[PDB]
Amino acid sequence: TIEKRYDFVFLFDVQDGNPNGDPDAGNLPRIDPQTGEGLVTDVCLKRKVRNFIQMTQNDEHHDIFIREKGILNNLIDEAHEQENVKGKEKGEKTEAARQYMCSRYYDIRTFGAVMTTGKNAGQVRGPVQLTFSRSIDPIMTL
DNA sequence: AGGAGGGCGAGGGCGATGCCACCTACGGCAAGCTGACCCTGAAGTTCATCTGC
């Protein structure tokens, strides 16, 4: 684990596309309606981190909490099919499954993952957290 | 077009729902009368009546 509380500003651009143009309440890039400032959802940037790590790390201890063929209950059950098959005493079983999701998956280590879904792998609060990235000036949507 | 529209799990926990006394006081529950008339008796004789003379 780390020992310093890094806090950062990420300034990223978008030139000729949707930064996070999937506000399915519509489709125009996610804007702040009262300012017109764009709102790249922090989950969009987290999915970008997921995709980068998937392209690059592509290893155990750096798994991604993956795309479409990533039905989450299946991945979470893969935590309950290991050292904590059943011998972890549900209160500790969830903790151990959560620990395995951390160690194995780079995303649950970096960000979190609501995993209390199938054989509940607990909640990870995501040491690294991004916030809704908003544009400094209001974005015009071409 | 084709999207996906929640997944999860919690929705009480705790104790208390009574404490206190009282649930009667007072007095009267009668008054006044009546509770029966009437007869019907034994024993004997009289007296009116009947039968027989």
SS3 A96: helix
**What are φ and ψ of residue A100, in 5° steps?**
-70, -40
User: Cα(A110)–Cα(A124) distance, rounded to whole angstroms?
Assistant: 9
Burial class (CB in 10 A: 0-12, 13-18, 19+), A78: middle
Closest CA to A78 of A43, A50, A115: A115
Scanning every strand, the nucleotide with its C1' closest to A76's CA turns out to be B7
**What sections of A30-70 are H helices per DSSP?**
42-56
User: Is the CB of A49 within 7 Å of strand B?
Assistant: no
User: Is the CB of A24 within 7 Å of strand B?
Assistant: yes
The alpha carbon dihedral of A25, A132, A115, A63 has a sign of positive
The packing angle between helices A90-104 and A72-79, to 10°, is 110
Q: Are A97 and A48 in contact (CB under 8 A)?
A: no
List protein-proximal bases of chain B (any atom < 7 A from a CB). 3-9
Q: Are A12 and A20 in contact (CB under 8 A)?
A: no
Closest CA to A141 of A4, A23, A11, A45: A23
> What is the token pair recorded at A58?
């592509």
Length A30 CA → B4 C1' (Å)? 17
Strand pairing partners for A40? A133
Length A27 CA → B8 C1' (Å)? 29
Cβ of A43: how many Cβ atoms within 10 Å?
Answer: 14
Query: In Å, how far are A11, A85, A93, A134 from A102, measured between CA atoms?
Result: 27, 17, 14, 29
**What sections of chain A are H helices per DSSP?**
42-56, 72-79, 90-104, 106-110
